[PDB]
Write a protein that binds this DNA or RNA. Structure first.
Ligand SMILES: [Co+2]
Lengths: 116, 122, 129, 371, 153, 69
RNA sequence: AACGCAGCUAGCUGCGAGAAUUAAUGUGAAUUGCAGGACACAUUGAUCAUCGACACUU
RNA sequence: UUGAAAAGAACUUUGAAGAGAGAGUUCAAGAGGGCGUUCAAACGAGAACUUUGAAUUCCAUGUGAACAGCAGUUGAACAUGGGUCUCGGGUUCAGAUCCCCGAAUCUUGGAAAGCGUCGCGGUUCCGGCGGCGUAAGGGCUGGUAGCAGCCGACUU
């Protein structure tokens, strides 16, 4: 012993091998693509954003994030997305602004959805 | 035209998934019609579609639990959910076997001196 | 007199139970007497009223011997509407007048599989006694 | 010789009548009930006749429109058959009318889109694009269409049936319409006309499927008064009792409409809107948007104050216009007229005629052998 | 009939206040229709809305008085309200004198009009308040040089 | 931005794959060539008209040429 | 304790992203302020009661 | 705490309305919804007070019961809709170092943009195209008690 102090020795630690699973089955995912997007918006300030700077306006779930929103909109409508901007409205709702890629055009896509 | 639980009980797992998918897409379309001008007929369909979705999900969730009930029928250890609930105090009391055991000393007294039936004439 | 320990004769309890009853219970309360000719045929004094039964009114302003068809059974207000019992509103429009089921007599009855079974059940009870 | 019409109508009306004088209507005396006396001086030449002469030019346009309408309805009646889609029927009728009328912008054309309504539906239904509705044997159809010459409009409608069972209902509605036309007169209270129509109509009964219904009027619907370039001039003729006591006047044009229903007798809105019109009272409202101002330009340059439908806008070549139209309706410039329907399983019938009340007599311009 | 909105948009578009906007008195109905910035831009281009000129504040009177005061017209003994030190700080007067009389002495040294040894003596006397002006100093230097020349001869 | 000083260097940079377009501006006293690359904008200033016209012809094939003037 | 859920809906009441309710069993033609929609009613069922299967945000 | 039951007062007539006079239902309304600083103009039914010219309260539209210690054609009042996404230029009825374009982390940027003025089309549509312009107190440079020249505010 070259030091005047005594320190606790190191010992073998083992991993868990449970004999039964505490929960029978994994919980179902309750935030899927359909739940992400509540509906689209048709107000007077949303109709100026489609015909000028190629964007779509949506109402989404409060607990979603920009990454989840981009995947959901892509899968449902088979479109490309560049940027998402989000704000929480004063009444407690979340509004997302999505910008389409240059190849795509908002006007035809919006007509397919039924918005315009 | 009408979704009844009895019809869907014996169908295959994949077939149920497709029906759930189609119903969800119908609901999303109806929601778009609510924000714009909507026909009285269209608005009233929302409640029918919403109940149909719940009905299919009940069948899916119910079927999967009996599959797990059979798998653990004879195993000593079961998942916590699959065990009986009752009450917390009831789960702590002794089982039927333990409650009626007796010592060797008590058994001898019962054999030697059984109770009798008698009547006193008067 | 009433001798049952677990039945109440209180005025306030009976009135509360009558005004606040589930819809299935209100069907039993709304019953009407059967006509003399029908009574002999089926040996049944009374039957619960239904949407499509012929009826005659025996009390009130509209008392008569005409026969009408029931058109709507309103259980919330304990009333029924008949074909020609009606008065005119100020505009010139016509409105139906509610009649309590106890003041009408059934002349002809709707016949369905379930109704035939209720009629049979009532007939046996009397004969046993 | 005098131009004769071809089997499929194609000659314009003006060619068939080069001189200028078009066929006349059915002329009858005014109702003799005038509080105990008759004005038989109205038939003789007087200052009334002098005033009447001053309006012969106006009457000619109405007679021309009536002739075109009669020819179009005669053509339509021949080939109508079950199994065809309603879009084809509407397109054929519109093309035939467009050819016979010889439309010249706002000089001539169709006042409103043709309306074909089935069963419970009573008015204001025309198939939009993408509609797949086929006529059935057990169906009742109402065809309403109109034409105008220089702002003089004619509105008439009839009912077409196949199955014989609806005969009694059609007869009752036709009788009520005829009685209403008979009662109409100058300086007569509208309420009396409504009472007469209701009393005549209520004395009828029908049996369809073996259940016994009573023919009763539809209280919501009513007649109207016609003006130049304005289909509704602000007067309504009721078909029921209990109403205002406005009086008719000479030189006025009226449409007498009767609707019959074997149901409750009230109508609500059930389906997608298809008819739009521009508001005559409104002035200048700031639009504040690029595309809806193109919409309003097109509207002002093709239709004016006459009604239009979405099929017409599609034919003009416009697309993606729904939001602009909705904004216009919200601002109050344009007004949407939605379809009116009765309870499911009910049946309806509609007969309408346009009459001119002249200073000297009463002329039923739309009258023809057919009805 | 009320034009509150149209007098606020115009001021923003013209980058001015609401006291410099003129609205046509006889064209009120046409102006009332405008409701957006795009329409306001159209009416300014058409003459209906104009920007009024700035009010005039001329400096001509004070420029004349300054020219008179340059020759001392309004200075006097009855027109001064502050102390002499307040009007001109005596520290500034001293500082200017030192720089003027120290720059002159240096220049003479490069041109070899004076030697370093005499230069050091004059520098300390300037610090002692002996000399007041350039003229007073140069005269002393000329007088000193003459005395040295005569002594040799 | 960056300033190129020699004509040859302008050719080498333009060949680069990142280069997206060339814009030519014709001022009264000079002609400027500007190439838009990934990170920077490079400018060549030619002061004589005759040399500039020769240079324009031999611009790298496939780079979209936009004439601002 | 909080926040959500109705065709038109603030509060009270009921419920929990299956959100004024799903399944099962009794019963047996309604609910209702207005509209729409159902429903041989047993090629199985509107509505209410009960409740033992399933589900249950922070 | 209306009435047995809304059968809750159609229609005519005065007034801008609130309010009335006739009618109508009911056994009963002697039961009627808490009931057994100056001058002009405009808009408006109406101007001492609103607008123009001359001396969640935010933002639109609509109203005038109640409130704003006088009034109100007005409102922070009442009803219905909408709005918060490392530099330089655009853009809204209401948001921008956050949206769009462009550059990044003396000269290249840079005149192509911005700002003045003068014009040409157009009228709920063109957000469209051009021409010009930006008495005494001191310095500096070139060379016997120094001079040549320009300059330069203030003070006693
Ligand atoms: Co008509």
């Amino acid at each position: 012993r070259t030091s005047p102090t005594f320190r606790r020795p190191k010992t073998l630690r083992l991993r868990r091998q449970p004999k039964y699973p505490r929960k029978s089955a994994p919980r179902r995912n309750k935030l899927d693509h359909y739940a992400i997007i509540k509906f689209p918006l048709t107000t007077e300030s949303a109709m100026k954003k489609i015909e000028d700077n190629n964007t779509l306006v949506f109402i989404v779930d409060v607990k979603a994030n920009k990454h989840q929103i981009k995947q959901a909109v892509k899968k449902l409508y088979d479109i490309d997305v560049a940027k998402v901007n989000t704000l929480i409205r004063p009444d407690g709702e979340k509004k997302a602004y999505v910008r389409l890629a240059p190849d795509y055009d908002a006007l035809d896509v919006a007509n397919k959805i039924g918005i315009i | 035209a009408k979704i009844k639980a009895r019809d869907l009980r014996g169908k295959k797992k994949e077939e149920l998934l497709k029906q759930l998918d189609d119903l969800k897409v119908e609901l999303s379309q109806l929601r778009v019609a609510k924000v714009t001008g909507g026909a009285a007929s269209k608005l009233s369909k929302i409640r029918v579609v919403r109940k149909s979705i719940a009905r299919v999900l009940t069948v899916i969730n119910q079927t999967q639990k009996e599959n797990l009930r059979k798998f653990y029928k004879g195993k000593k250890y079961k998942p916590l959910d699959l065990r009986p609930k009752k009450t917390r105090a009831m789960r702590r009391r002794l089982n039927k076997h333990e409650e009626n055991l007796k010592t060797k000393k008590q058994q001898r007294k019962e054999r030697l001196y059984p109770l009798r039936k008698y009547a006193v004439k008067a | 007199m009433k001798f049952n320990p677990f039945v109440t004769s209180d005025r306030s309890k009976n009135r509360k139970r009558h005004f606040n009853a589930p819809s299935h219970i209100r069907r039993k309360i709304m019953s009407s007497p059967l006509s003399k000719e029908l009574r002999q045929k089926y040996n049944v004094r009374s039957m619960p009223i239904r949407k499509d039964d012929e009826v005659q009114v025996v009390r009130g302003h509209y008392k008569g011997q005409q026969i009408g068809k029931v058109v709507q059974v309103y259980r919330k207000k304990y009333v029924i509407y008949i074909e020609r019992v009606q008065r005119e509103k100020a505009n010139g429009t016509t409105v139906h007048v509610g009649i309590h089921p106890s003041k009408v007599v059934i002349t002809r009855l709707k016949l369905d599989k379930d109704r035939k079974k209720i009629l049979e059940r009532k007939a046996k009870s009397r004969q046993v006694g | 010789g005098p131009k004769v019409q071809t089997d499929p109508p194609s000659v314009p009306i003006c060619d068939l009548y080069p001189n200028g004088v078009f066929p006349k209507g059915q002329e009858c005396e005014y109702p003799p009930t005038q509080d105990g006396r008759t004005a038989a001086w109205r038939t003789t030449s007087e200052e009334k006749k002098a005033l009447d002469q001053a309006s012969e030019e106006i009457w000619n346009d109405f007679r021309e429109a009536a002739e075109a309408h009669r020819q179009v309805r005669k053509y339509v009646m021949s080939w109508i058959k079950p199994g065809m889609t309603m879009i084809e029927i509407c397109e054929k009728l519109e093309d035939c009318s467009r050819k016979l009328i010889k439309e010249n912008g706002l000089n001539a054309g169709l006042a409103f889109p043709t309306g074909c309504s089935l069963n419970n539906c009573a008015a204001h239904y025309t198939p939009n694009a993408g509609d797949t509705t086929v006529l059935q044997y057990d169906d009742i159809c109402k065809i309403d269409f109109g034409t105008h010459i220089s702002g003089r409009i004619i509105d008439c409608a009839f009912t077409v049936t196949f199955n014989p069972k609806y005969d009694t209902l059609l007869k009752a509605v036709k009788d009520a319409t005829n009685t209403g036309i008979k009662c109409a007169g100058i300086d007569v209270r509208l309420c009396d006309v409504g009472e007469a129509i209701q009393e005549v109509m209520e004395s009828y009964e029908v049996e369809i499927d073996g259940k016994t219904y009573q023919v009763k009027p539809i209280r919501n619907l009513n007649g109207h008064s016609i003006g130049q370039y304005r289909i509704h001039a602000g007067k309504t003729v009721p078909i029921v009792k209990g109403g205002e006591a406005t009086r008719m006047e000479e030189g006025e044009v009226y449409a007498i409409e009767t609707f019959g229903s074997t149901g409750k007798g009230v109508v609500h809105d059930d389906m997608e809107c298809s008819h739009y019109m521009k508001n005559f009272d409104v002035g200048h409202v700031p639009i504040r948007l690029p595309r809806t101002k193109h919409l309003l330009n097109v509207i002002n340059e093709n239709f004016g104050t006459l009604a239009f439908c979405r099929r017409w806008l599609d034919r003009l070549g416009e697309s993606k216009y729904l939001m602009a139209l909705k904004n216009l309706c919200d601002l109050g410039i344009v007004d949407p007229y939605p379809p009116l329907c009765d309870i499911k399983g009910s049946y309806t019938a509609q007969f309408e005629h346009t009459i001119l009340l002249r200073p000297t007599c009463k002329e039923v311009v739309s009258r023809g052998d057919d009805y | 009939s009320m034009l509150r909105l149209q007098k606020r948009l115009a001021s923003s578009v013209l980058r001015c206040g609401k006291k410099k906007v003129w609205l046509d008195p006889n064209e009120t109905n046409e102006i009332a229709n405008a409701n957006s910035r795009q329409q306001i831009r159209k009416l300014i281009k058409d003459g209906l809305i104009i920007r009024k000129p700035v009010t005039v504040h001329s400096r001509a009177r004070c420029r004349k008085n300054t020219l008179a005061r340059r020759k001392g017209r309004h200075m006097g003994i009855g027109k001064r309200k502050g102390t002499a030190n307040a009007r001109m700080p005596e520290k500034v007067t001293w500082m200017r004198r030192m720089r003027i009389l120290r720059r002159l002495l240096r220049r003479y040294r490069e041109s070899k009009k004076i030697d370093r040894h005499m230069y050091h003596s004059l520098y300390l006397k300037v610090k002692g308040n002996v000399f007041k002006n350039k003229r007073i100093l140069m005269e002393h230097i000329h007088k000193l040089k003459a005395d040295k020349a005569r002594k040799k001869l | 931005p960056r300033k190129i000083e020699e004509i040859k260097d302008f050719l080498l940079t333009a060949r680069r794959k990142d280069a997206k377009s060339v814009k030519i501006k014709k001022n009264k006293d000079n002609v400027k060539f500007k190439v838009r690359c990934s990170r920077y904008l490079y400018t060549l200033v030619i002061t004589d008209k005759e040399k500039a016209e020769k240079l324009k012809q031999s611009l790298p094939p496939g780079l979209a040429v936009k004439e601002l003037k």
